[PDB]
Amino acid sequence: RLYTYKRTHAAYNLLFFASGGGKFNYQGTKRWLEDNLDHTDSSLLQDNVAFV
Amino acid sequence: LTRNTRIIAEALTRVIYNLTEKGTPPDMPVFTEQMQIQQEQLDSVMDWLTN
Amino acid sequence: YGTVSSLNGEPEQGVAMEAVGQNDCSIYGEDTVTDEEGKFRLRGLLPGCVYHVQLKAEGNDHIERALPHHRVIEVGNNDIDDVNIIVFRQINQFDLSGNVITSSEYLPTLWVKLYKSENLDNPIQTVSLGQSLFFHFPPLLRDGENYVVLLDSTLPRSQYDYILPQVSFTAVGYHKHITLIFNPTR
């Protein structure tokens, strides 16, 4: 709702991640964070990542 | 759940929009109407999740 | 002497701006339609009374909220400066939603409806549930408009027993989470 409207379109890329593999040592996050960092060079997980 | 969502979302909104150095004292909220955290939606989603 | 900007920073234009006084000064106060930058030029600078910058009732139909509704400012022996207020526009859509409670196998054989109240034989939306227990009817306008959410399944009574739910949600609010429960028998 906030991003849909121009006047409230803040300049902050937001990567939401409904991760799987949670209480299991957070494997879903491990694999996801690995794929967006070392596998590729694109993706926002390198651009200007603020607090996660 | 609604209160926690209000707290987190309002903090995020203030930090994102540079509001702190824009006035907006923390003694009044953003999410009053037209953006109220849908209690029904939260309850139904939680119920479905527990289903 | 400030600015009327949007949430992101967009300077609002054409917003009526005024200051209503209090105490004996309740009778003093003028208005000024803001410019593109949001720079209002309120005048009538009488000290000895606190001021309240707030949104004119008239001329501000399109705009829904002003987050700092009023800003208390002490009027001393000088002028005021740097008065920034953020404002919200008036979203008019309804943004319907709503989950469905049913077994997984019945989900593909379901299409939620949006039967208008005035005519229950001419649906206006037939969002199929498909494989997701969540319909997200495209945002509608909110003005009365009693509707129906008749859950039109494809499953006939010849091999199963069921009752299709029906929900009326007269559109005056801003969201909805219809929670249809579908448990057929036989």
Curated annotation (Swiss-Prot), chain A:
Subunit structure: Component of the back of Sec61 (BOS) complex, composed of NCLN/Nicalin, NOMO (NOMO1, NOMO2 or NOMO3) and TMEM147. The BOS complex is part of the multi-pass translocon (MPT) complex, composed of three subcomplexes, the GEL complex (composed of RAB5IF/OPTI and TMCO1), the BOS complex (composed of NCLN/Nicalin, NOMO and TMEM147) and the PAT complex (composed of WDR83OS/Asterix and CCDC47). The MPT complex associates with the SEC61 complex.
Function: Component of the multi-pass translocon (MPT) complex that mediates insertion of multi-pass membrane proteins into the lipid bilayer of membranes. The MPT complex takes over after the SEC61 complex: following membrane insertion of the first few transmembrane segments of proteins by the SEC61 complex, the MPT complex occludes the lateral gate of the SEC61 complex to promote insertion of subsequent transmembrane regions. May antagonize Nodal signaling and subsequent organization of axial structures during mesodermal patterning, via its interaction with NOMO.
Residue range from the parent sequence: 257 to 308 of 563
Tissue-wise expression: Highly expressed in pancreas and skeletal muscle and, at lower levels, in heart.
Cysteines joined through disulfide linkages: none
Organism: Homo sapiens (Human)
Domain of life: Eukaryota
Name of the protein in question: BOS complex subunit NCLN
Subcellular location field: Endoplasmic reticulum membrane
Family in the record: Belongs to the nicastrin family.
UniProtKB/Swiss-Prot annotation, chain B:
Tissue specificity as recorded in UniProt: Highly expressed in pancreas and skeletal muscle and, at lower levels, in heart.
Positions bearing carbohydrate: 18
Domain of life: Eukaryota
Record's subcellular location: Endoplasmic reticulum membrane
Quaternary structure annotation from Swiss-Prot or TrEMBL: Component of the back of Sec61 (BOS) complex, composed of NCLN/Nicalin, NOMO (NOMO1, NOMO2 or NOMO3) and TMEM147. The BOS complex is part of the multi-pass translocon (MPT) complex, composed of three subcomplexes, the GEL complex (composed of RAB5IF/OPTI and TMCO1), the BOS complex (composed of NCLN/Nicalin, NOMO and TMEM147) and the PAT complex (composed of WDR83OS/Asterix and CCDC47). The MPT complex associates with the SEC61 complex.
Family: Belongs to the nicastrin family.
Described function: Component of the multi-pass translocon (MPT) complex that mediates insertion of multi-pass membrane proteins into the lipid bilayer of membranes. The MPT complex takes over after the SEC61 complex: following membrane insertion of the first few transmembrane segments of proteins by the SEC61 complex, the MPT complex occludes the lateral gate of the SEC61 complex to promote insertion of subsequent transmembrane regions. May antagonize Nodal signaling and subsequent organization of axial structures during mesodermal patterning, via its interaction with NOMO.
Protein name: BOS complex subunit NCLN
Highest classification ranks of the organism: Eukaryota, Metazoa, Chordata, Craniata, Vertebrata
Gene assigned in the entry: NCLN
Curated annotation (Swiss-Prot), chain C:
Tissue distribution: Highly expressed in pancreas and skeletal muscle and, at lower levels, in heart.
Domain of life of the native organism: Eukaryota
Subcellular location: Endoplasmic reticulum membrane
Role description: Component of the multi-pass translocon (MPT) complex that mediates insertion of multi-pass membrane proteins into the lipid bilayer of membranes. The MPT complex takes over after the SEC61 complex: following membrane insertion of the first few transmembrane segments of proteins by the SEC61 complex, the MPT complex occludes the lateral gate of the SEC61 complex to promote insertion of subsequent transmembrane regions.
Quaternary structure annotation from Swiss-Prot or TrEMBL: Component of the back of Sec61 (BOS) complex, composed of NCLN/Nicalin, NOMO (NOMO1, NOMO2 or NOMO3) and TMEM147. The BOS complex is part of the multi-pass translocon (MPT) complex, composed of three subcomplexes, the GEL complex (composed of RAB5IF/OPTI and TMCO1), the BOS complex (composed of NCLN/Nicalin, NOMO and TMEM147) and the PAT complex (composed of WDR83OS/Asterix and CCDC47). The MPT complex associates with the SEC61 complex. Due to the strong similarity between NOMO1, NOMO2 and NOMO3, similar interaction pattern probably occur for the three gene copies.
The name this protein goes by in its record: BOS complex subunit NOMO2
